[PDB]
Curated annotation (Swiss-Prot), chain A:
Residue window of the full protein shown: 1 to 351 of 527
Protein name (database record): V(D)J recombination-activating protein 2
Top-level taxon of the source organism: Eukaryota
Written domain comment of the UniProt record: The atypical PHD-type zinc finger recognizes and binds histone H3 trimethylated on 'Lys-4' (H3K4me3).
Subunit and partners: Component of the RAG complex composed of core components RAG1 and RAG2, and associated component HMGB1 or HMGB2.
UniProtKB/Swiss-Prot annotation, chain B:
Location in the cell: Nucleus
Family indicated by similarity: Belongs to the RAG1 family.
Post-translational modification: Autoubiquitinated in the presence of CDC34/UBCH3.
Complete-protein stretch covered: 569 to 662 of 1040
Subunit and partners: Homodimer. Component of the RAG complex composed of core components RAG1 and RAG2, and associated component HMGB1 or HMGB2. Interacts with DCAF1, leading to recruitment of the CUL4A-RBX1-DDB1-DCAF1/VPRBP complex to ubiquitinate proteins and limit error-prone repair during V(D)J recombination.
Binding site for a divalent metal cation: D32
Function: Catalytic component of the RAG complex, a multiprotein complex that mediates the DNA cleavage phase during V(D)J recombination. V(D)J recombination assembles a diverse repertoire of immunoglobulin and T-cell receptor genes in developing B and T-lymphocytes through rearrangement of different V (variable), in some cases D (diversity), and J (joining) gene segments. In the RAG complex, RAG1 mediates the DNA-binding to the conserved recombination signal sequences (RSS) and catalyzes the DNA cleavage activities by introducing a double-strand break between the RSS and the adjacent coding segment.
Annotated phenotype, changing D32N: Loss of cleavage (both nicking and hairpin formation)
Entry comment describing in which tissues the protein is expressed: Maturing lymphoid cells and central nervous system.
Comment on protein domains: The RING-type zinc finger mediates the E3 ubiquitin-protein ligase activity.
Protein name: V(D)J recombination-activating protein 1
Coiled coil location: none
Gene null: resulting phenotype: Mice display a severe combined immunodeficiency phenotype. The have a small lymphoid organs that do not contain mature B and T-lymphocytes. The arrest of B- and T-cell differentiation occurs at an early stage and correlates with the inability to perform V(D)J recombination. The frequency of homologous immunoglobulin pairing is much lower. No obvious neuroanatomical or behavioral abnormalities have been observed.
Length: 346, 94
């Protein structure tokens, strides 16, 4: 809880609400810039190197057999830390159309602060989930195997009820649970009767056999379910099985950022409480063997700007460090389009 | 709006007023991001704001009389101030 303002280089405008910060061995990489990829950086990815409160967005090449992926804006990013690699699912192509491909980010070659990524296009079969954004995917382990739990987020209307006078309206996807096999890219949808209403922009914490879904926004009624869910999974010799349990003490937040401050101990920072109240309080989530425990922590001191501005975003860098953003006074002495902050958490 | 003009066109082309052939229309599409469309309401020259106007222009109308396409209508001043029908307009950088 040590806030600290940051200064950005020349290509500052690339950072936009919805950016991703992937992480490889303490080396952070910005993804999801604004506008299609330029020619000064053909791929979109960037070394997100912060030193002395100054970050240098540096271009970063791909491999020779990778696949150039568009800059998405609200993907599902899960760290399949098993040959470290990330999984990207869905998002908003700069043409405001949603995507459904899965992308796999590995590192094919590195030499003295010069990385060469490898982004491969994994496609799904079976009960493929809907092209959507705002959702959340997490890799969960069971009985020596792994699987991907994807829980719904909002999307565009289907190709039937999509009129052009409301072409951009969005509906929360049905609250299913998608189990995704990466070894074959196979999807399987399960309708947990305990999950009722649609949910997007939530927070999902995986602990080695479960998924703790928490907070989020429910557009079907414009509320924020303060509940939470524990999706227990188990992988038999044949068809997997899932169960859910509601628990008390759930936060009421959407767009809250997550990072793993300590081993089996997460922090969570402000999303939004009400459409006028940005969330200020920070909450530490003590995981464990079976029992989650959300609690409140030392209310980090927010500067004047952060208490003035009404929207604010960011993501975790990976080592208990949350990078933030603030729009900045429009009617001002040519205030920049975005100011940026960083919060350590030890 | 140009009903009367294209009726006069069919008259001039020695056709029937009461002809309902499949009139093929040829429309032009034009989008141009004009900039600095703001004005100082009070004190402070601060903010420049831009705009975009997507518009079209009915460029020609042609009926397929029998087995030939006759030009029932052609725009006199195609790229003129006052035939570019506005369609959409927004306040946003191009
Ligand atoms: Ca122009």
């Amino acid at each position: 809880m040590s806030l600290q303002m940051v200064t950005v280089g020349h290509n500052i405008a690339l950072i936009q609400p919805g950016f991703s910060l992937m992480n490889f061995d303490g080396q952070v990489f910005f993804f999801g810039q604004k506008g299609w990829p330029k020619r000064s950086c053909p791929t979109g990815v960037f070394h997100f190197d912060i030193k002395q409160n100054h970050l240098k967005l540096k271009p970063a090449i791909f491999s020779k057999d990778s696949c150039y992926l568009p800059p998405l804006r609200y993907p599902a990013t899960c760290s399949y830390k098993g040959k470290h690699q990330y999984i990207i699912h869905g998002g908003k192509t700069p043409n405001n159309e949603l995507s459904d491909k899965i992308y796999i980010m590995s590192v094919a070659c590195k030499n003295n602060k010069k990385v060469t990524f490898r982004c491969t296009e994994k496609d799904l079969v079976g009960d493929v989930p809907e092209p959507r954004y705002g959702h959340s995917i997490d890799v969960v382990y069971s009985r020596g195997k792994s699987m991907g739990v994807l829980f719904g987020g909002r999307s565009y209307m289907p190709s039937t009820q999509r009129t052009t006078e409301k072409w951009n309206s969005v509906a929360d996807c049905l609250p299913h649970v998608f189990l995704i096999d990466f070894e074959f890219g196979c999807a399987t949808s399960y309708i947990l009767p305990e999950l009722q209403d649609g949910l997007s922009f939530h927070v999902s914490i995986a602990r080695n056999d479960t998924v703790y879904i928490l907070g989020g926004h429910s557009l079907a009624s414009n509320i924020r379910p303060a509940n939470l869910y524990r999706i227990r999974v188990d992988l038999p010799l044949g068809t997997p099985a899932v169960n859910c349990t509601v628990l008390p003490g759930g936060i009421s937040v959407s767009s809250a950022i997550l990072t793993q401050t300590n081993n089996d101990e997460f922090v969570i920072v402000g999303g939004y409480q009400l459409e006028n109240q940005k969330r200020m309080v920070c909450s530490l989530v003590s995981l464990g063997d079976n029992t989650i425990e959300i609690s409140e922590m030392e209310t980090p001191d927010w500067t004047s700007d952060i208490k003035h501005s009404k929207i604010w975003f960011g993501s975790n860098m990976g080592n208990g460090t949350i990078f933030l953003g603030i729009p900045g006074d429009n009617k001002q002495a040519m205030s920049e389009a975005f100011y940026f902050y960083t919060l350590r958490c030890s | 709006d140009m009903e009367e003009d294209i009726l006069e066109g069919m008259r001039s082309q020695d056709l029937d007023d009461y002809l309902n052939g499949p009139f093929t229309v040829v429309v032009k599409e034009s989008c141009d991001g004009m900039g600095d469309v703001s004005e100082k309401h009070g004190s402070g020259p601060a903010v420049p704001e831009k705009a975009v106007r997507f518009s079209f222009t009915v460029m020609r109308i042609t009926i397929e009389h029998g087995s030939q396409n006759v030009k029932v209508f052609e725009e006199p001043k195609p790229n003129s101030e006052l035939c570019c029908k506005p369609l959409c307009l927004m306040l946003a950088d191009e």
